[model samples]
Target: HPNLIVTEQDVANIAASWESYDAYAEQLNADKTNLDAFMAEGVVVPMPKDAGGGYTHEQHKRNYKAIRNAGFLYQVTGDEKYLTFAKDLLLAYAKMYPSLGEHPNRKEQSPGRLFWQSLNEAVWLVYSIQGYDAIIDGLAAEEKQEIESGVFLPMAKFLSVESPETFNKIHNHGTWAVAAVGMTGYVLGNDELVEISLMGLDKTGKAGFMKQLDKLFSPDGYYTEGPYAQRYALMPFIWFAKAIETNEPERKIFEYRNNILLKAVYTTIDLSYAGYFFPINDALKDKGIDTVELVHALAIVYSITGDNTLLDIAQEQGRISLTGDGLKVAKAVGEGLTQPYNYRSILLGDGADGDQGALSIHRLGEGHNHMALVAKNTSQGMGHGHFDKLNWLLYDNGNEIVTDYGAARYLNVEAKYGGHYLAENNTWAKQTIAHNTLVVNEQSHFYGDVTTADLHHPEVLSFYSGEDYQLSSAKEANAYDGVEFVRSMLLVNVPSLEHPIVVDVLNVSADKASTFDLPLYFNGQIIDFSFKVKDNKNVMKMLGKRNGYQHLWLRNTAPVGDASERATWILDDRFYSYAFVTSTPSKKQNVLIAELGANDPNYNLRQQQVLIRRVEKAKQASFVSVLEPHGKYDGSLETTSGAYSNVKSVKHVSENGKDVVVVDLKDGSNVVVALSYNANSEQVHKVNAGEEAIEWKGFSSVVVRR
Candidate 1:
């Protein structure tokens, strides 16, 4: 009744229908023969040297399943070529099964007949189910016996029934196992195996899966591992349901408990943007709702249930899945599918656990880690989670100039071998230090222990307000109690002026007045951090970090002393200034800056190098600050080695004889200057400031004016 409501007869007819099977059988057979030949002998075909290390074996399974699907297609179509070809591939798999040993590189790991992962085996069974169904009725009893004994049983044992390590969990791996056995059971008409798969094996003492499903996902449908794993898991769950719905009419599988598979798929799709999914959790790069799995699943689900929206999405993806009769419905809907697909980004308020009025900010990335900001108040993704407990990133207009350098490793790939999960990933990425946010005393969120997730409390303030993007979030631990911490970020963009500038003001307040550090990742042209006294014009100014002098291995440190007058640190050709101050007219705040590291041990840590201080005082309250460059601060800086890295580096060039500061930073990197002080350039004797010896230790703003 909800949508795409399918019937068992649909499956039976497709199994016997020419349009469902015969139509694609011959073409599939020919393609498989050519592809199989190439896979077996291709010089470029490389096997995964280790478990979960390569794609060759996965593709091999995909090949097998595709071939098997063609055979079913032929069976339903009465096409001899499809059947013969499928027969050949099944025999080949049979031959390969015995010779296969535990993966050559992985120690006693699950053996891969085609590739190294059990997931690939799952894929094989998912597709081959259709092929087996197609040929089962027509084949001789001896032929069915050989297929079941030689291939199916061994695969099942290797992938699931035999190895608890490989198949017992409620992962994509487990999902694949369930589908394979369920589909094979339907083909062999083996009720015992089906019961074990759906329920559990009494003899093996293994719980099949049903219980794991409920716990594995949030009530609102967010998968525990994030979006990438959700994408993989959806295929098995949905396709298996389709198989059951078709073969066992009285079971009413589709009518069971709101169809959990659909719920998962729908939620996963809802968390995407412009054909791409937001990589909020442990998601794959560029994964979207529009994929081969979703295409067929959505289309068929739409047709059986009459959901126009899904039909709309299925047609757009183009590659229908091999779910027997569902393929027909998907093809019809997809061939006419032309409308655009849109997955709305909504604020998921609360823990997604039926909690009301709790705030959760949702945004989509064009690719993985490219979009989505869960704001300050939200639960951390189970595994593959970053330590940015309260902070987030935004991607708009095709660029993520402002970014959090995600995981340090390429992960299960060959590209970056040694730089795998660099030091910063564990030290910085997993540390609160890595995010572009406010830090109090360098203490990690949740006291650095993730399992103690409940102990960490970063407030999620109001969503949108007038002219400012206010994100009020903070962390508190035992080391710093009686001192409730509050950190707030406000963004302001003025349009009335000729050159619109975005002003980003980050403020942190503590009861005890401990050291509050703000690390900015910015982009612009005119960038500088300087300070001036309340009334005076000429004052002290400097570059880089707070306490840059004392903390730095400075080449020189001339104590200029005290900041009483106005001074400005100009950058990009002069775009902004970062003012620093303390209430007492004395130099209490230390500014130390580090230069950018192109190939830093922490994966390009933008160092805090230059130091600035407000030795001067104001008429009222004092605030610590710096003028950011008009360009990206995350841009390439002149490291001691002269290497350029990102867009944050200050680039100076003559233009039209009249220098106009063009902020080349991507959308998120632009921040406007809120307060300004004047400075004389000739006084501060600094030139060609490369990566080395740019320290202004024990120096005041007045020295730059001398």
Candidate 2:
């Protein structure tokens, strides 16, 4: 009787495995969790007007989620109460929606009637439409007409006809609106609505779902925003694309763009480590593969391609869709058709043309949990993107050894700035000094201007991944005026080393002498630093007056060490040493130890520690560092080895646009990473580095014998 994402056969298949299958059971488990509350609380569709995480906000969320859950519960359990509960909420919305006005909590987002933002309204429509389709057979003709005319169509019209700005926009918000309206059009069998969703309001191919697919993702399947936004946008793309395939099969929407949506899924999966996505841009640190969006995506992709490798992630996700895709995935798992998913080193490009640099990932080890050195060298991710370009983060030993502050605002916590992005988001989280990158004159990239930042991006100079080592390098000239900084990072495994080492070299060339600060934010307790420090315990000091520096408290300061120096920290069961050397000619350089959350009244910002190297008014400088993850602690066995860095020294020498990082191990073995930024050529070049003769061709390396 009803046809949508899930069919009668789909329901029957799930029923067959309801008791035996973990996927089906978990779906039921989740549905029942919501059903219990829906039954107890009853339906309360208030004339809501509140920000996120407020009473009205939470209640509306409960209503939409419960209604969707009730639909699944009714279909599976043959429970009449479930039908009534879903229908009751639908009717309540129909009654209130007609008379409701714009939401009060309007800021950047377009206001909604049921919710504060149109984004939430679009989300509600998507869920409610699917739930309504599932329970349509049980509703009477009059009841169906009433709900359709008063609630669904009117809501769709408001989001589409009333707000053409958002509906026609090529963004995640627009993606949601199109999916909700398009799916509604399918269920209602409205040609005009579906056409408009596929095309633009003028029936032109300028701004619509197809255009969004064309512009929103790179050829490499990397989304315009970071991984978190990709995670959110992917759900809508998957759902709406599925709706198109079901109703209009001749279009072959899945085959469009060489299966870019599916490619996007894989790219997103690779962007994560230790079960969590890289917390770049405005992202929550906790969202992992187990999140519902990925769970749904994994099930659907596997259903179509029969890609057994996805099953490993599906198994890790441990939840399935309550639809046909879920049935397919669950059935496959039961038959034991699972292959391991490979996590590889990749350079996924950014912009639509793949010209705006890339998110370079250097991964070591197998499967999902491994060591990852990430380079965020992509374009500005619109509004959600931070001002930190050419930033790097390290992941190893199932932990974030180096960190990104993520977002300053607490998600859905009403007490924290009305559950919206706090002021500190722009001040601290989005600033240049907050990230592991070069900060010139203490200013953020593009001066924290989204409009300016969106116009510029970094240029990737060279990238290569070998069996033994992975290398990536890029330069950002527009981040600061008359300033060009090229950063090259190599993640290599030496034959004698106990762990994979990260050799980082930042080359900053300036027209005039200016102050430069390079900050490294890491996760762990500080054990030791090579340089001596003066601890400022009793007197608290703010690093600066404005920008991100205002939040950092300078705890310790030391004269820059001339020798090959290193700082070691311990985290969980592992130890990491950051051995560094710089060529600045000036002996007045200083190293500052700091942490965040200074001048914070509500405690919005995280107090993560930062190790900052400061060079004053340097016209030209080079920062060379090596990060080594070594040793482990076993509390059960009470054992430890390689507790510190065995790498004795690191040296940086730059001449004629070629740079070399010479890493010396304690055993006298040396590995030299020689790079040429001016040319990615095959011609051989001899370089003089600390009196040792070196020869390499086009960013090659040499391992010296003892």
Tell me each candidate's TM-score: 0.62, 0.96
lDDT of 2 by residue, 54-127 (tens): 77877888778887778877887777988998998898888778887888776677999888889989999988
Using alpha carbons, what is the TM-score of model 1?
0.62
How many residue pairs in model 1 have overlapping backbones? 75
Question: Which residue runs of candidate 1 sit more than 4 Å off their true CA positions?
Answer: 1-69, 72-79, 95-101, 107-120, 158-160, 202-207, 249-259, 311-359, 362-376, 398-404, 411-415, 418-429, 447-706
Q: Against the unseen true structure, what C-alpha lDDT does each candidate score? A: 0.46, 0.85
Candidate 2 has a TM-score of: 0.96
On the 0 to 100 scale, the lDDT of residue 82 in model 1 is: 63
Q: lDDT of candidate 2?
A: 0.85
Measured by lDDT, the strongest candidate is: 2
Give lDDT: candidate 1, residue 215: 50
RMSD of each: 13.5, 1.8
- Residue 547 in candidate 2, Cα distance off native in Å: 1.3
